[PDB]
Design a protein around this ligand. Sequence first.
Ligand SMILES: Nc1ncnc2c1ncn2[C@@H]1O[C@H](COP(=O)(O)OP(=O)(O)OP(O)(O)=S)[C@@H](O)[C@H]1O
Ligand SMILES: Nc1ncnc2c1ncn2[C@@H]1O[C@H](COP(=O)(O)OP(=O)(O)OP(O)(O)=S)[C@@H](O)[C@H]1O
Ligand SMILES: [Mg+2]
Ligand SMILES: [Mg+2]
Lengths: 344, 353
Amino acid sequence: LPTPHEIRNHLDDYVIGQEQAKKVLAVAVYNHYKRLRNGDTSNGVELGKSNILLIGPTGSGKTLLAETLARLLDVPFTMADATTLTEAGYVGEDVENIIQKLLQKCDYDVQKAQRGIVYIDEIDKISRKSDNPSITRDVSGEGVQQALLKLIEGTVAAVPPQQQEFLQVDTSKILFICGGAFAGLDKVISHRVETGSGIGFGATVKAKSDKASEGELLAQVEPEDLIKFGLIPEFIGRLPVVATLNELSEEALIQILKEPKNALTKQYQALFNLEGVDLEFRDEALDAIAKKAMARKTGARGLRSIVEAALLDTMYDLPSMEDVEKVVIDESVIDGQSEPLLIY
Amino acid sequence: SALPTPHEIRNHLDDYVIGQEQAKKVLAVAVYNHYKRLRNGDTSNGVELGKSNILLIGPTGSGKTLLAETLARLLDVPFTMADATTLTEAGYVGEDVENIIQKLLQKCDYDVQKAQRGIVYIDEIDKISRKSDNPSITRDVSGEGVQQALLKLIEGTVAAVPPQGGRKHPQQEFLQVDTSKILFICGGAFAGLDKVISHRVETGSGIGFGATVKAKSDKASEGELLAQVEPEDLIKFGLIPEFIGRLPVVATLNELSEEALIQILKEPKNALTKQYQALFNLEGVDLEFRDEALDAIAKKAMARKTGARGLRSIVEAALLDTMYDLPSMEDVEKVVIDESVIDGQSEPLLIYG
Ligand SMILES: Nc1ncnc2c1ncn2[C@@H]1O[C@H](COP(=O)(O)OP(=O)(O)OP(O)(O)=S)[C@@H](O)[C@H]1O
Ligand SMILES: Nc1ncnc2c1ncn2[C@@H]1O[C@H](COP(=O)(O)OP(=O)(O)OP(O)(O)=S)[C@@H](O)[C@H]1O
Ligand SMILES: [Mg+2]
Ligand SMILES: [Mg+2]
């Protein structure tokens, strides 16, 4: 019987920050459990479902939230690509593949599948760039969206085996969570509340808002902006809950190095201990690597590349070296000007 | 037999649907006629009674799908719901048009006789429409192809429904089902149809000095255009002329106004406000919505342009913080939400008892 606070604490153990989005997923999961426990509600009232939509830059942890949250979930869970889907009548993979994919973790059971949770990533890619029907029916941006319109609410869909039974499974009680890096969307929101004046004299010129981070603009996202981005109004309606993330800053990246349980620093420490050596990272060293990552715009994913190169030489001669007790990493080795300290 | 009269059946529909009078009467008349034709199965009189398919056109969140669900409850005949997007032209991986009848058989317990007198609802019918360049120099299977295959099925034909799908899989005598008495109701939100209607009813002019109409920006809303819908406009949208003909009666909805949203919040049997109240009751805390608060959410929902679905996001966002801390906090017996909480200027009010 987990509660919103309990779910929040468990999620914070793996991913830090993103408090705004953490409350959205925690409350949604708690509400889902209550509905599953009591469907009729003993009052003749049918409880609906509220789908979520995640809008954040790449490397912000959108997929990390679903993976970590999946462990706590006690119901079947699955992930989707959103890029391999195709409209009915075309090669590839129909949208129905999401439902059957969930059955993989539910031992192919309809009863348990109806109470599962489905998460789709990379939803931004499936969007009509032209914002209107093209000369030929799009099979990746518009075709997939139309099929998903009716698949997000009820619409009992067949489940092709793995021979033609096509067992029916209800999708009315299956919560749907969406998420994707809507590239360029930040500009759509800005243009809506950026300028509303003319050019020549006699115009109510308005001062442009000071430089605002991408996270601030996304915080003001509304369905109108999504429509102009290439999302049909029907699809937006299916996703009432809207949450946005914030780009990681210098302080956020430094925290991700130690605070997370599965942080890259902890993983490397255990790796060295496997062969019989201990590794430690100085506070200054962590700050240097974090700053370098943002300089190259590589993001959070780059933290693993910088550290790998810095310790590449040490790991080459680490197991071969004998009579070694500890390894010290400072700020002078991040830039490569000084060889990492080693004691015997 | 005690066949429900159109007025009685319409009253039940009002319980789950609000702000819809033209569509409720059309559906009530067609369903009532369906029962009458069932009694006269042998058509004692020389003249044989036919069927009149319906077509629903309206914006998103207008109650097109909700009407089919609520009506299916009263319909004693097997009722089925199908998606036009999944359907494709025959001979392809996508589901064929014959699958519609297959699903109906399951609802009737493999009873072919009962399948003859049935009602189907092809939701998202507007999806299968000729896109730009109606001629379609290329072969279209998920668009015009579906409409062509639906010409004989909607009008009525003997389709050899496969005997699989929950029954004996091996090859056997394919069941013969006649769709000459199945009332087909197509419903979908034809996006962009309003623009085509305006180009016809509303006269347009270019640039000039005399005999030119400026046509100021402030004109009739798109709702009025949808009301005066002509089959010619539908053909220009992408529907083949032979397809629109199968649907003689066409009922159009109207965009929900501010007053309509308020009624939908309480009057419906399963309303948005009542759903949240029950959710809070499970943990042991009551929920109440002030009259002024309902007005604020309704007004803010209209600007969303997402139909009735907008109310779901407005109430969820306002109560996002309430539900996140309510279970953790104890000694809570009720929550009061006023107008000052909808706009977010003041946090939700709570009383400890
Ligand atoms: N806030 C964060 N805290 C800790 N680690 C993070 C965070 N954000 C990203 N990471 C790390 O970055 C890795 C990849 O990030 P993702 O979860 O893929 O974010 P993403 O934006 O969803 O990527 P996509 O889906 O390809 S756009 C994760 O496995 C984490 O190790
Ligand atoms: N007339 C109405 N009365 C009460 N609730 C309504 C009404 N219209 C819409 N709703 C609400 O909106 C929800 C969605 O209804 P739908 O009919 O499925 O929307 P829709 O218009 O069918 O979407 P499209 O256009 O088919 S994609 C319902 O479950 C109700 O909660
Ligand atoms: Mg991802
Ligand atoms: Mg619908």
